[PDB]
Amino acid sequence: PQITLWQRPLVTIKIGGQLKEALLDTGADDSVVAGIELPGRWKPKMIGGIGGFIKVRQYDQILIEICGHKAIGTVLVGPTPVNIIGRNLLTQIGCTLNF
Amino acid sequence: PQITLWQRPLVTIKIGGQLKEALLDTGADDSVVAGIELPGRWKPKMIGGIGGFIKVRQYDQILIEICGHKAIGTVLVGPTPVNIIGRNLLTQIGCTLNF
Ligand SMILES: CC(C)[C@H](NC(=O)[C@H](Cc1ccccc1)C[C@H](O)[C@H](Cc1ccccc1)NC(=O)OC(C)(C)C)c1ncc[nH]1
Numbered sequence: 001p002q003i004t005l006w007q008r009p010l011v012t013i014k015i016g017g018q019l020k021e022a023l024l025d026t027g028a029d030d031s032v033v034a035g036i037e038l039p040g041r042w043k044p045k046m047i048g049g050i051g052g053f054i055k056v057r058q059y060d061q062i063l064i065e066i067c068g069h070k071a072i073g074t075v076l077v078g079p080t081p082v083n084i085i086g087r088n089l090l091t092q093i094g095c096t097l098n099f
Numbered sequence: 100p101q102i103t104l105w106q107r108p109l110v111t112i113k114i115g116g117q118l119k120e121a122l123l124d125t126g127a128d129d130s131v132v133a134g135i136e137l138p139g140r141w142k143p144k145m146i147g148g149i150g151g152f153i154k155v156r157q158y159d160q161i162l163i164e165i166c167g168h169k170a171i172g173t174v175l176v177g178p179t180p181v182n183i184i185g186r187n188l189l190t191q192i193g194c195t196l197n198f
Contacts, residue, residue, distance in 0.1 A: 003196040005186040009125050024196055025126030026108050027183060032149065050131065050179045052150035069198070080149045084126060087104040097102040097123055099168070099194040 001067075002098075013085065014065040015075065020083055022066070026097060028086030031064075032056055032076040045076060054079045069093040100166070101197075112184065113164035114174065119182055121165070125196055127185035130163075131155055131175040146175060153177055168192040 003009045009024040018036050030047055042057035056078025064071050066085055071092040102108045108123040117135045129146055141156040155177030162171050165184055170191035 001198070005125060005189045005194060005196065008128070008186075009196055023126045025124070026104060026196075027122050027124030027126055027181075029107070047149070048180060049148040049150045050146070050183075051148055051153045054149050081147075082126075084149075087107075090104050093198055095104060095196060095198040097104070097108050097125075097194065098197045099100065099189075099192050 011067045011085065013067075013083070015062065022083035022085045024090065024095065025084045025086050026090070028084045029088065030074065030076050031084055031086040031089050032078060032080045033083045034078065034080045036077060038062060038075065038077055042077075047076060056080075064089060066093055110166045110184070112166075112182065115161065121182035121184045123165075123189065123194065124183045124185055125189070127183045128187065129173065129175055130183055130185040130188050131177055131179045132182045133177070133179045135176065137161065137174070137176055141176070144175065146177070153179075163188060165192050 010021050013022045045058040046053045046055050056076040059075050062075045073089045109120045112121045141158050144157045145152045145154050155175035157175050159173050161174040172188050
């Protein structure tokens with residue numbers, strides 16, 4: 001759908017059987033979700049934002065349903081304030097920026 | 100323009116005479132630019148992403164030109180890693196998220 005940006009572009013995601021709300025974030029290369037039990041292995045990764053870096057866990061091949069659209073990609077789990085759906089998932093659901 | 104998100108959505112800005120590139124960011128409420136000299140007065144405000152809060156200087160009524168589209172809003176000047184054009188400016192240039 002066409003999302004206007006007057007309010008925060010929050011969407012509902014279904015990941016690992018858990019229902020959560022997440023931000024459609026064009027300034028995020030990677031998607032980082034906090035507080036979800038995700039099974040399997042992980043590699044260390046450190047991602048940077050404004051104010052610095054945080055250490056998260058890189059989980060691969062995780063299925064995500066972002067507003068009823070299916071995608072499989074990389075999900076970082078760790079200390080974020082808000083759940084971020086970054087470009088690595090936004091491309092799969094065919095999300096574009098228009099103006 | 101229609102921007103696909105396979106590459107970072109970097110766009111040209113003309114702010115207070117200085118030319119710079121800035122990332123169109125749906126996940127940013129505010130706009131923050133690094134390195135520019137800006138006219139006038141400012142209040143303190145601290146803003147925070149993942150990682151932490153940082154101290155920025157907020158100047159209101161700044162004329163910024165985002166890819167030939169002119170807009171006036173609050174620009175925060177502080178040590179950011181990349182320049183961010185947040186939703187407060189994205190709404191004025193008519194930016195919408197589509198899928
Ligand atoms: C992995 C994501 C988290 C990260 N992106 C961000 O942090 C981007 C900007 C950025 C890109 C590249 C380098 C530095 C900063 C900012 C995010 O959109 C964050 C998401 C967020 C919102 C609210 C609370 C906490 C986090 N927004 C944000 O920082 O907004 C403000 C208004 C504070 C500038 C990123 N993109 C590329 C590399 N790292």
